[PDB]
Amino acid sequence: KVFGRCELAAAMKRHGLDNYRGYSLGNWVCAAKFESNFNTQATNRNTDGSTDYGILQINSRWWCNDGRTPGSRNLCNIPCSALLSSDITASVNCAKKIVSDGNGMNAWVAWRNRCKGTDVQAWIRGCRL
Numbered sequence: 001k002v003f004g005r006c007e008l009a010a011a012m013k014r015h016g017l018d019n020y021r022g023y024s025l026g027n028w029v030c031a032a033k034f035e036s037n038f039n040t041q042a043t044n045r046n047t048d049g050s051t052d053y054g055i056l057q058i059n060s061r062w063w064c065n066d067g068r069t070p071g072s073r074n075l076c077n078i079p080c081s082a083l084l085s086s087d088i089t090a091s092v093n094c095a096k097k098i099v100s101d102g103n104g105m106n107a108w109v110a111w112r113n114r115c116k117g118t119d120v121q122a123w124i125r126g127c128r129l
């Protein structure tokens with residue numbers, strides 16, 4: 001599923017992402033845009049052999065199991081395919097664990113290089129939340 005900006009804002013808010021660990025909703029919407037273009041089915045293979053999955057591009061090396069990543073820790077205890085669903089519950093629940101880790105949202109390269117230090121509030125402007 002390809003989410004609309006406000007549509008995704010509302011689903012993330014409903015799932016408790018607004019201000020989760022101090023990160024306003026705009027941060028999450030901004031990260032999803034630049035990580036997957038709001039597409040739940042997005043996949044990207046990395047040079048280390050791992051693959052990123054879903055709306056928030058969760059990595060198969062540490063967070064999910066895709067059956068082809070050697071030394072996968074599967075910290076979210078879910079098959080990576082579960083992260084490609086039109087229902088963002090699995091991705092949001094795994095994202096909460098990642099963000100609670102240690103480096104916060106810096107774990108998402110797109111957030112660090114394109115959202116961090118910007119007016120992320122603009123990502124939810126006009127949305128009925």
Ligand SMILES: Cc1ccc(S(=O)(=O)O)cc1
Nearest residue numbers: 033034035036037042043
């Ligand atoms: C902004 C943007 C556009 C396209 C993709 S893609 O899923 O890797 O093709 C990811 C992020």
